[PDB]
Structures are given as C-alpha cells and as structure tokens.
C-alpha cells in the first residue's frame, strides 16, 4: 500500500482528438475534491490502481494525494523493481526502496481529467472531474510525482506546499481508512498473453 502525491496537470478529453490542458483557474471553483476518483494509467480503461484522497487548490497549484491499492499492480511493479534490468536501467544504481524509485521515474506525471472548459465556464450538468492518471509522458505544470509508504512523508517533499497547506492535506488522508476503498480494476497485461 503506497501513497502518491504531486501537483497535477489538468487535461480535458485526454489523449483524444480534442485534448487540451487547462489553466488551473478554469477548474478551481470546483475544488476541493474530497470524494475518491479512480487513479488509472495514461487515461486507460481498466488500469485502475488506486483512489484519490483529496484534490486541493494550494498556493502553487492543484495538489493530489492518492493511495495506490491494487494488489495485482503493487505485486507486479514490485517484482519488476527487484528483478527487471529494464525497469531499473533509468534509475540510479542500487536504490533503497526500488519500487518507489521505479514509480517516481517511469510515472512522474499526475494528470487530472476534466470536462471541456466550454462546460466549465457555464454551470456543468454533471461531475467536472473523472479520474487522475499516472502518466509516462505529458507533464507540464505538474511536479514529478512522489511515491512513499506514508502520506505525511510524501506531502513533506514538496517545498511549495506550506505547513498549513500540508496540514490541510493530511487531515483527509487520515479521514479515509484505506481499507474501506473499493478494489480497483487493474489487471496485469502480462497473462493476457
Ligand atoms: O500489452 C502489453 O504487452 C503492454 C506492454 C507495455 C505496457 N507498458 C508500457 O509500455 C509502459 C511505458 C512506460 C511506463 C509504464 C508503467 C510501468 C513502468 C514500469 C514499472 C511499473 C509501471 N508502462 C503495457 N501497459 C501497461 C499499462 C499499465 C501498467 C503497466 O505496467 C505494469 F504492467 F507493469 F503494471 C503497463 C502493456
Ligand atoms: O516476466 C518478467 O520477468 C518481465 C520483467 C520485466 C518486463 N518489462 C519491464 O520491466 C518494463 C518496464 C517498462 C516498460 C516495459 C515495456 C517494454 C519491454 C517489454 C515489452 C514492451 C516494451 N517493460 C517484462 N515484460 C513486460 C511485457 C508486457 C508488459 C510489461 O509491464 C510493463 F511494461 F509495464 F513493465 C512488462 C517481463
């Protein structure tokens, strides 16, 4: 069970013909998001690995904290981190905690999916946000995502998050028992072979 944290990029209609990144202010009226959104990979169906634990406007942007909870994904990633020369190639040699490093390097981007801003300027009918994705490519305003085993340690790593803002981010992790989150739908794309 891991935590992830970072500032996000806001993307409308991701990876499709109409993809467009949004100014955070285009969606800050719809923050904070206190209810769990799925965390997926590269905006792909059926790659749920976790659930968000809060999305907040802070001084420097929109900060996301999440929980990576998928047993299939954690087991696969961790096995890769211990035995795959390919996974480890772009990481510093001999890391302590290779799983954290592997994730930090291969999935540095947090991408928050939203409806098109033509809906957001007016009054939206339904949910403004759909999910947060861990992304290999496309990070812009977002920071490099931090992965760790305890939520306070993760939020602690960003210097552009104040002690009060951090004290406005840890209440909500500790407000949701990880055990009570739904089981995410990630399946290893290995034994599909
Ligand atoms: O169908 C195939 O054969 C198939 C082949 C390759 C795939 N991935 C990449 O090319 C790729 C590229 C960059 C980053 C990542 C995330 C990994 C990075 C290493 C350590 C954990 C997570 N994946 C995927 N797609 C994929 C979907 C989600 C997670 C994923 O990684 C893992 F399976 F390890 F969970 C792979 C599928
Ligand atoms: O069984 C083993 O010991 C085994 C161990 C490690 C493997 N790969 C990685 O560490 C790795 C890491 C990052 C990207 C990729 C994709 C590359 C390489 C695979 C073919 C697509 C191009 N692979 C795989 N190969 C593999 C197949 C399909 C998906 C996959 O997951 C993922 F790409 F996400 F790592 C890994 C197998």
**Deposited resolution, Å:** 2.0
Collapsed DSSP state (helix, strand, coil) of residue 83: helix
Q: What is the spatial distance between Cα 150 and Cα 173, in angstroms, rounded to a whole number?
A: 10
Contacts of 89 (CB under 8 A, 6+ apart): none
Alpha-carbon distance values, 140 to 10, 53, 135 (Å): 10, 22, 11
Q: Are 60 and 7 in contact (CB under 8 A)?
A: yes
* Peptide bond connecting 177 to the previous residue in cis, omega within 30 degrees of 0: no
Asked if residue 89 has its Cβ within 6 Å of ligand 2, the reply is no
Asked if residue 137 has its Cβ within 6 Å of ligand 2, the reply is no
Residue nearest ligand 1's atom 18 by CA: 106
Asked if residue 189 has its Cβ within 6 Å of ligand 2, the reply is yes
Q: The sheet that has 50-58: what strands, in order across it?
A: 20-22, 9-12, 109-114, 129-135, 38-41, 50-58, 61-68, 2-7, 146-148
User: Residue 117: phi, psi to the nearest 5?
Assistant: -65, -20
Tell me, in angstroms, the distance from the centre of ligand 1 to residue 161's CA: 31
Domains of the chain from N-terminus onward:
1-193 (3.20.16.10)
Residue nearest ligand 2's atom 13 by CA: 87
Contacts of 9 (CB under 8 A, 6+ apart): 21, 109, 110, 111, 112, 138, 139, 140, 141, 142
Ligand nearest to the CA of 42: 1
Measured from the Cα of 81, ligand 1's closest atom is: 20
Contacts of 184 (CB under 8 A, 6+ apart): 38, 39, 48, 49, 50, 51, 69, 70, 73
Residues known to be catalytic: 43, 111, 131
Ligand nearest to the CA of 102: 1
């Amino acid at each position: 069970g891991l935590y992830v944290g970072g500032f996000v990029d806001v993307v409308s209609c991701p990876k499709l013909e109409q993809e467009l990144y949004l100014d955070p202010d285009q969606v800050t009226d719809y923050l904070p998001v206190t209810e769990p959104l799925p965390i997926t990979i590269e905006h792909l169906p059926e790659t749920e690995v976790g659930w968000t634990l809060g999305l907040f406007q802070v001084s420097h942007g929109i900060f996301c904290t999440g929980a990576i909870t998928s047993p299939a994904f954690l087991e696969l990633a961790s096995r890769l981190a211990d035995t795959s020369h390919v996974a480890r190639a772009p990481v510093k040699n001999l890391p302590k905690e290779p799983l954290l490093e592997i994730l930090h390097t291969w999935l540095p981007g947090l991408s928050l999916s939203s409806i098109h801003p033509r809906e957001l300027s007016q009054t939206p009918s339904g949910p403004v946000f759909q999910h947060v994705s861990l992304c290999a490519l496309g990070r812009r305003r977002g920071t490099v995502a931090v992965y760790g085993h305890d939520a306070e340690w993760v939020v602690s790593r960003f210097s552009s998050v104040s002690k009060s803002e951090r004290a406005h981010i840890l209440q909500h992790v500790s407000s949701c028992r990880l055990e009570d989150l739904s089981t995410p739908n990630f399946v290893s794309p290995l034994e599909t072979l």
